[PDB]
Design a protein around this ligand. Structure first.
Ligand SMILES: Cc1cccc(C(=O)NCC(=O)O)c1
Length: 185
């Protein structure tokens, strides 16, 4: 792909984070803490899952960023509407305002309803995410495998401003403590 020149500097929005997340001083890394991180509750925080949003809101144009997922066993990545549900249980789907892929139990899947199996021969250590607002496209790229395409959502009905979306996943296994990191331009 040739999307690198649409690179945007994403930072994480602390106020949206699940109360167990630890976001770095530079707001570029996030991992699961082993306890509540001593913050007040608010209506923005994701309550049920270890999720956080980017601070940036996109309503036009082409945007590209990269995320490091080295040594994680589970995570979700993509974009979502600014008005997605924060509290309680929900599935990641375009009907609920999410355009995402994930790793879970040694398989990669796109967050369609129902979910779609991905075909990845080289497990990625870094993921590239491309959004074309006007075209209604969200695409995912395998940076470890020379930028190969992972998945394209097309005919997207965003129906609102978009925010970068992250889930570091639970760490029940003791093998999923590693952070998500926003990679430099
Ligand atoms: C305290 C702790 C435990 C496990 C992992 C980390 C972490 O930041 N990952 C390593 C890295 O910086 O690449 C921190």
């Amino acid at each position: 792909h040739h999307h690198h020149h649409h690179m945007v500097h994403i930072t994480l929005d602390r106020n949206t984070a699940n109360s167990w997340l630890i976001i770095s001083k530079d707001r570029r890394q996030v991992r699961m803490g082993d306890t509540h991180q001593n913050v007040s509750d608010n209506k923005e925080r994701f309550s049920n899952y270890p999720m956080v949003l980017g601070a940036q809101r996109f309503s036009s144009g082409k945007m590209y960023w990269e995320v490091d997922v080295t040594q994680k066993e589970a995570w979700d990545l993509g974009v979502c509407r600014d008005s997605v549900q924060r509290k309680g249980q929900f599935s990641l789907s375009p009907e609920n305002g999410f355009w995402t892929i994930w790793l879970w139990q040694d398989s990669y899947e796109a967050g369609t309803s129902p979910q779609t199996t991905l075909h990845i021969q080289v497990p990625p250590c870094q993921i590239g995410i491309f959004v074309d607002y006007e075209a209604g496209v969200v695409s995912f790229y395998n940076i470890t495998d020379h930028g190969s395409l992972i998945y394209t959502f097309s005919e997207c009905v965003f129906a609102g401003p978009l925010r970068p979306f992250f889930n570091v996943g639970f760490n029940y296994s003791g093998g999923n403590a590693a952070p998500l990191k926003l990679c430099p331009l």
